[PDB]
C-alpha cells in the first residue's frame, strides 16, 4: 500500500517544486521501514529466548512515532484542505487513510506488548 502513495508523491515532487512534499515522503518511508521492523520484531515472539529484548527501546520508538504520526496526519489533512488539484487530492486522501490505519495499528500493538 505504501508503494502506491510513495510513487504518487514521487510524481508530485517531480512535476513541481514542493520540498514539504519531500519531507512528507521521507517521513512516509521512515514509517514504512518502522512498520517492517516492527513486523520483524513480532516475528520475535512467544518463544522465550529473551522475548521483549527492548521493552524500553520499543517504548521510546513507539512514543516518538506516535508524535510523528500525529504530526503527519495533521499536515496531510492541512494539505488536503488547501490543495485543489485532483491528483494531489487523491494522493493525500489515500495517504490519510493509510496513516489512520497504521497509527491505530501501532496503538493496538503497543497495548498488546505492554
Amino acid at each position: 500500500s505504501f508503494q502506491d502513495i510513495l510513487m504518487r508523491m514521487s510524481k508530485m515532487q517531480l512535476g513541481s517544486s514542493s520540498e514539504d512534499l519531500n519531507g512528507i515522503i521521507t517521513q512516509f518511508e521512515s514509517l514504512k521501514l518502522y512498520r517492517d521492523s516492527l513486523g520483524e520484531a513480532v516475528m520475535r515472539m512467544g518463544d522465550l529466548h529473551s522475548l521483549q529484548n527492548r521493552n524500553g527501546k520499543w517504548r521510546e520508538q513507539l512514543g516518538q512515532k506516535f508524535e510523528e504520526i500525529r504530526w503527519l496526519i495533521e499536515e496531510v489533512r492541512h494539505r488536503l484542505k488547501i490543495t485543489e488539484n485532483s491528483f494531489e487530492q487523491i494522493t493525500f486522501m489515500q495517504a490519510l487513510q493509510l496513516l489512520l490505519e497504521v497509527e491505530q495499528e501501532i496503538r493496538t500493538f503497543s497495548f498488546q506488548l505492554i
Binding site: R35, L38, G39, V42, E101, Q104, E105, T108, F109, Q112
Partner: peptide, 9 residues
C-alpha cells in the same frame, strides 16, 4: 488481519 496483528476498523 495484518502480519503484525489484528487491527480493528
Amino acid at each position: 488481519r495484518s502480519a503484525i496483528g489484528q487491527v480493528s476498523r
